[PDB]
């Protein structure tokens with residue numbers, strides 16, 4: 001028997017208020033043929049995880065009594081890296097020691113262990129397997145734990161919608177210091193796309209500009225510069241010198257920021273909105289729609305990959321390969337380790353409260 | 365030789381300041397192959413016509429000395445109905461007596477005659493031709509003169525982008541009392557598309573509402589109702605009752621209004637923005653793009669039809685057939701005859717000054 005812990009809530013609300021820890025038992029001596037038990041290695045706290053708990057995110061796990069609660073309760077977290085510890089008699093796709101991520105959203109990754117079917121998981125190579133296969137690197141725990149959402153989001157936005165001519169075309173994105181933003185800059189470099197990252201001003205602005213440039217941003221500007229009529233002709237000069245066009249805007253901010261990046265595209269431009277700060281709506285001047293053949297659409301990786309295992313597979317495989325090859329890098333998570341001395345839900349509550357410090361990964 | 369008059373301007377500004385009438389000569393014996401001489405029967409005044417005169421609209425006819433002017437001068441009007449009076453050696457498509465509209469924008473329809481190529485025109489049936497093909501009626505001058513823009517825009521917005529299931533599906537539009545608005549309501553009814561028109565409140569609301577419903581708006585709401593979270597479920601009931609979905613939004617207002625009509629669409633909705641009342645950007649909640657698969661695009665009849673004559677004529681053929689099958693009603697213009705009582709440009713100048721009374725048609 002296994003005494004596991006899960007972070008649950010019986011009612012929607014702010015993580016600081018509604019989360020608790022529930023002890024639950026998994027009978028590892030009673031696996032059905034296709035069942036698998038996994039041990040969590042690490043799971044991050046993403047904004048979507050928080051929005052789920054708050055009740056403002058339209059995709060979420062059902063509240064049930066399955067963790068042994070009196071009242072119906074839901075688990076938390078959508079992304080995570082797990083280690084297979086035992087498999088049922090009919091399981092061939094996974095073996096003990098293997099690394100896996102959930103195959104679907106709403107699995108509940110803020111917990112120590114899970115019991116599921118073999119098809120509830122997707123195998124990733126563990127470091128020993130990458131090394132045995134001749135690869136110069138294996139995945140870190142943070143890389144495996146965050147591979148499912150942000151890297152895939154960047155890659156698909158860049159490649160699945162409009163075709164940028166290598167060596168000349170441009171994308172422009174806001175939220176340039178975001179995890180997605182940082183992956184997009186790297187993928188831009190890898191595919192030879194030019195790009196402009198728009199970021200908020202900050203005390204170490206110049207140092208951040210230089211880091212984003214090292215990742216693959218061609219140019220980095222502030223939101224002030226994005227807003228600026230004075231500065232606008234400088235950006236046109238960059239694009240004209242390249243021989244290419246700005247064809248794609250990636251928006252995770254909304255409001256004025258969205259207006260600014262849209263205005264920087266050439267005719268026939270496409271914006272993809274994948275996020276939104278401060279509840280500020282996407283705001284686009286009428287003239288761009290009418291006179292510049294501008295299109296504005298959405299991106300949600302959960303929905304795009306819902307019924308498209310093949311695209312998911314192909315994309316995930318490219319990200320894995322790039323990690324193994326040392327061609328892609330993750331932003332450094334702040335890791336908090338669960339040892340059983342502080343309730344698990346409190347580790348996640350701290351992580352939510354400390355979101356501003358960096359991406360928070362709870363490890364095990 | 366034909367003695368003709370044209371409404372010109374030597375430079376951009378307000379129609380009350382800059383327009384004048386120029387008499388010039390059309391040689392109808394010094395001809396060319398593929399050439400066609402036409403007499404104007406009627407031409408309307410549209411906002412875009414005025415926007416060209418003002419020099420704000422980025423598509424306009426060139427300034428030449430070809431009307432016999434001392435300084436370079438541009439003609440006026442993009443829409444009009446004409447009669448062919450003479451053709452060149454190699455013109456088979458057109459014949460004397462035939463009715464025609466311009467093939468393309470920037471024709472200059474605010475004048476008494478024109479010499480163009482036969483590819484410069486598209487044939488419409490004259491009343492005698494329609495009636496000789498067994499039709500109950502033939503087009504009136506107003507119907508032919510005004511056919512090219514507003515009925516086409518509406519027909520095209522409603523049919524060329526998404527397919528609404530007849531007797532089931534809905535579109536929503538703001539600027540409900542606009543000319544386009546009024547055609548869309550009609551065409552919607554003919555195609556058996558359900559529709560919601562949004563209009564501003566006024567003291568004579570009841571009368572405006574009745575007039576729009578007579579034209580075929582299924583439901584008319586105020587912008588206050590458009591703004592209302594409380595009223596949302598009432599609209600959802602309408603749509604469910606019809607066993608359909610709201611798939612399409614037509615925006616010509618922007619700001620809050622654009623936000624409200626977007627929110628009323630079911631998942632996978634499209635907004636087309638074809639105008640923009642006063643300063644207001646297209647403003648769309650992030651959640652719609654991410655969670656509702658919402659797309660926001662532009663519409664500009666000119667650009668869509670620049671290199672698409674098969675689509676242009678196919679749409680005209682349907683408008684024409686409905687016309688005087690007696691199934692479509694034109695918007696009813698206030699006409700003023702160019703009968704020598706006042707100079708030609710003063711006729712147009714008055715219709716611009718008198719835009720608020722309704723659509724102004726100069727006849728000949």
Ligand SMILES: NC(=O)c1ccc[n+]([C@@H]2O[C@H](COP(=O)([O-])OP(=O)(O)OC[C@H]3O[C@@H](n4cnc5c(N)ncnc54)[C@H](OP(=O)(O)O)[C@@H]3O)[C@@H](O)[C@H]2O)c1
Pocket residue numbers: 046047048149150153175176177178179180181200252253273274275276277278299300301302359654
């Ligand atoms: N639709 C999808 O498929 C999907 C998938 C992945 C991500 N997303 C979206 O992407 C965003 C988070 O992704 P992530 O994991 O990369 O987050 P992250 O690493 O925590 O980064 C968050 C970003 O948001 C910026 N930001 C915060 N408040 C802002 C404001 N008021 N104005 C402008 N920028 C602001 C931050 O800038 P600073 O560094 O200056 O603080 C930072 O760049 C969310 O909006 C999320 O919904 C959506």
